[PDB]
Point group: C3
């Protein structure tokens, strides 16, 4: 009797799970919203400098109208290799945002010290990969208490991580010079200082890794193996040749209903082989609406979670009206940021600019009154942005990359408490000039020369 | 000199052969119609109870408009595993019909007794697979003389199996309680009774398998191996890692011309990569026209074969006019049944209901006069039905599943000799009310409450 | 720590490289046009007789409108096996043209004698493959100096090989009887005559291979292994299981920009998953415009290269206006031939016939005045031709096959110095009858009975 080969089955549920971390796929938590969970772990925030600049160059005539295809290919070639390392070292990729990603090693408190060594080793191997293409890898690490919030409505779900370790990991990555691995103060306080050799960082308690200095009988493979005891989903035994246990998920309509809620419709269409793969990688003209909600205490999930859910319910209803979409949510700019996009697949519409502005104003008005929201800031920028699936075959997400994405984020940060827009949006909108105010030009982190910027004052 | 890997070649001919049994693929018989062949074997009829009910639930809002995709995924996950067992145990899957399938082990008369043991073992392993999802597997087995009929025209071919073993296998499966394996009387008469332990079945000569009771020196692998001598296409040697020898078929335009005639155009389009895969799995509104032809002796292929071919030639010409398609033909309801569908891919048309009724009347009028056809009955029902490819990658077919499919079949059986329709069809058709007669409500096997039923009396 | 499977990555650059020889993929030469390179090697020109005739038969009703699909499947089944042999024996496939291909073994002068033995062995194994389907394999071999010319503009590139060995290989193949391997005179002069047993060919210095007659201690595997020292891209070591080193190419935007210029837009669309695969294999009505440029010395690349580039620049600009495309360029008919097509994917347009004729006249007028071009001849024929991707998964190209392709080539050869057309083109064009002249019928190599032929005299 034969024992024939079992071909890998790429069921729709498996394809869906590529878009999500193990934290969600194997989380099986309540469908109630907001939902909050608390745990400890080590975070890694990896950023490829320089793709944002390459993006503009891939629109040029030398690319012969295949810029989007070339961009995604070269980006994914590099990001795939970073994803593989993270996964092989036992991490869970939580999210991609542009040319960066955030990974988590969730463990019990007693295991943080050892897992920090694992993650540093991983980081140094990732630093390794690229001595190549004007691009640099910067890595920030943090460790400690982490909260997760899941929010949404009956057909859409989103999650976010919250807390000091989350803020620290982004602060650490922002200090990295072009190839550094930076540890947060708490990470450094919890790590095995007898093996990790660091330099200090000016006016900073975070530190920079120089190298690992193992002791005499230390063997990293044996050490790693001990650490895998604490890794619930590390592929093993018959499945040790897989990059994710998620590749083995089996059809289950209840689970698939739950997971799909995290994924946008247009991506589900592709998964379901109802649209040609070529069409989700595009350089398309869009308007970014980058919404920031600041709270008194941005580390306190039980406080901020209800407020986020409240804001989300309104945000989603006005985006529906004005035809925009939430691409990503994350803690960023000392609060909760929503990266919204006007002109994604299926929503390229005339009067997009006007709509983006009216939507921004509405969200500003509403969110300003959610009582625990202290300040709302919204940046609106329009231009050609890369929209597509970034990552590895086994772990990837739809994201946006572009100078206008960065501009909208910087506007929102440098002009708090108001709705701002760039010149393209201003000049292209239907709206009368006196609905706007031309603003003082501010020198902004990583922004060459936006032309004039404006406040959208509204019909007031 | 290198000996490089030879990648599997999924030629169009191989993709076509997934849709057909070895009985056709390797049959090389005459293109003349009707064609009849006679042989012996063991039949297995496997039915998943409960998908028909799940179908209705996959239209509900909880499925977020991906019901067809979820349905097919969960169905195929389960059916694939059953197909694999059948194939590994040496069976030929003849046909899928909804959530059931029919498999054949063709052998010489002397080998029936041993092959029956093989098929029972297979059955018990399939019974095994599912202690899981409100779904149960019921299996009926028969053994003896079998006839095959091939019928059609110059561009379409169909086949069917005929005879007492064929009737017995469906009778046996209809008696199975929710997880039973039932043997037909003749199967029980031919089997190795010294190993097969059974309970009797009330008012029935068919029996129920409890277990296999092998003798002392018996080894099933060694036994199976002896049995493989009689299996012409059992994958072996270099190809022992394949589920079907058909996976090795090589391009051959003559053979492909012959095989394609069995496959619908829309499926050939997909095979030929002229349509997105996503589009053949759908929950779509259709009208089922279930045609039953009864003969004096439904086991006598040389009698009934010419009549079937005659009926087929007319059926296909009126379906062409009224825009319907034959989905399946099989012996069922004490005669030859044609499962016809209005509104398949490419044939969603306005006035579908009217057309389905006019077509039914025409077929009724014509087939009533084919002299060896004793009675014609036709049931017509309209609603949302699952249309898509069911089975395993290596062996699968386009089929329909739905409460309205079952209703049309039950109408045709419980209201013989006339054309009947359900309320949706009646209410939605163009036709005047006096073309119909409201009928007495009958309590019908596996039907909750159809609203009123009607006879289509016609313009008479 | 796991070492998980690395799935093959079919990046766009790898898919592009399937369409090109190693001569281009790994050539890294100047983007300046014309560019010329000089080297030595052995050429093999392999032709499948009989597909051109099968093409007409695949339009018949027996193929049930899947003729294009059946044709390509059976063609590629056979051509794939020939491609595999060529590649395993270390050859570079340069180009496909219809049902023929041209392969190169580039080596230093001292290695020609040994590599000729390798290529003969390959040839005899290819002769081997087909004792099968009215089809025969004819092979011509040549060896010596070869020149390469690359020509084009800022977004399109083409290459061609030039010289006596190039002319000899096509002459050798034209003398092959239905299964022969023929050596050019120079090939025979350079080969190891002590192992190669030949018959002479009447009124010819080329010879026919009967067999290899190795000496006593000769071992072909050991011999081949020595020869692989001279093969720069022979897959080896970890990659010895690959048919091409090109399957390992990694993303590189500079290289991809360069390579894509050789590939037509419609094929790039498919590579980029922006169109269903099914659509590039078609039997479509087209007009072939076969342009031949004769020079004084067709072996002298530094002479003819500037002229070809000049002609190309005009040809491409008028084809753009009249909506045609260059499918292939090669040395053929004692000069440089351009195989142009009106009605490819995306360019099916009304008044195609007229356009093809106006374009032909324009090209004739212009190219006649490029001073080193001695004579221009252009044949124009219209009919159903097979258009699609021919070859192996790892090495394939878009090409055309059809009786009208052959007719246009034969017209251009047998009616030099003028623009000619067939009856379909004449009868179907918009143009007045007196723009044409009916011509004497000539008996033409491999052409049954074109109806009348005409000169396109023009408005003169
Ligand atoms: Cl997050
Ligand atoms: Cl998000
Ligand atoms: Cl049947
Ligand atoms: Cl059927
Ligand atoms: Cl060439
Ligand atoms: Cl070419
Ligand atoms: Mg970045
Ligand atoms: Mg059923
Ligand atoms: Mg040829």
């Amino acid at each position: 009797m034969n024992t024939p080969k079992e071909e890998f089955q790429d069921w729709p549920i498996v394809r869906i799970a590529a878009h999500l971390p193990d934290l969600i796929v194997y989380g099986h938590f309540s469908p109630e919203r907001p939902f909050m969970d608390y745990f400890d772990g080590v975070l890694m925030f990896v950023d490829i400098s320089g793709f944002t600049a390459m993006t503009e160059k891939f629109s040029s005539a030398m690319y012969m109208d295949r810029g989007a295809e070339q961009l995604v290919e070269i980006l994914n070639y590099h990001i795939s290799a970073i994803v593989e390392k993270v996964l092989i070292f036992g991490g869970d990729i939580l999210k991609f945002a542009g040319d960066a990603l955030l990974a988590l090693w969730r463990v019990e408190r007693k295991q943080l010290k050892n897992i920090i060594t694992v993650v540093i080793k991983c980081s140094l191997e990732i630093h390794g990969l690229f001595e190549t293409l004007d691009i640099r890898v910067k890595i920030g690490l943090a460790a400690g208490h982490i909260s997760m919030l899941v929010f949404g409505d009956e057909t859409h779900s989103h999650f976010l991580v919250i807390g000091q370790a989350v803020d620290d990991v982004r602060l650490a990555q922002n200090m990295a010079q072009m190839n550094d691995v930076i540890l947060s103060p708490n990470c450094w306080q919890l790590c095995d200082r007898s093996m990790i050799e660091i330099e200090s960082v000016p006016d900073q308690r975070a530190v920079k890794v120089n190298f690992l200095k193992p002791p005499p009988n230390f063997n990293f493979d044996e050490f790693f193996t001990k650490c895998t005891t604490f890794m619930h989903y590390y592929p093993s035994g018959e499945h040790k040749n897989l990059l994710r246990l998620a590749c083995t998920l089996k059809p289950d309509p209840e689970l698939e209903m739950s997971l799909q809620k995290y994924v946008m419709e247009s991506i589900l269409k592709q998964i379901d082989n109802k649209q040609l793969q070529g069409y989700l990688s595009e350089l398309r003209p869009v308007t970014i609406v980058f919404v920031n909600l600041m709270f008194e205490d941005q580390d306190k999930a039980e406080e901020i979670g209800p407020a986020i859910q409240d804001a989300y319910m309104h945000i989603t209803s006005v985006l529906k009206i004005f035809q925009g979409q939430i691409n990503k949510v994350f803690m960023f700019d000392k609060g909760c940021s929503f990266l919204c996009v006007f002109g994604f697949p299926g929503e390229k519409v005339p009067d997009e600019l006007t709509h983006a502005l009216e939507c921004a104003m509405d969200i500003f008005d509403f969110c300003s009154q959610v009582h625990k929201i202290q300040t709302v800031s919204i940046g609106v920028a329009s231009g050609i942005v890369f929209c597509g699936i970034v990552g590895h075959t086994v772990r990837h997400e739809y994201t946006v990359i572009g100078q206008k994405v960065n501009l909208a984020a910087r506007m929102m940060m440098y002009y708090p408490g108001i709705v701002t827009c760039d010149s393209v949006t201003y000049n292209g909108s239907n709206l009368p000039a006196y609905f706007f105010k031309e603003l003082p030009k501010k020198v902004m982190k990583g922004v060459a020369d936006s032309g004039p910027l404006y406040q959208y004052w509204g019909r007031t």
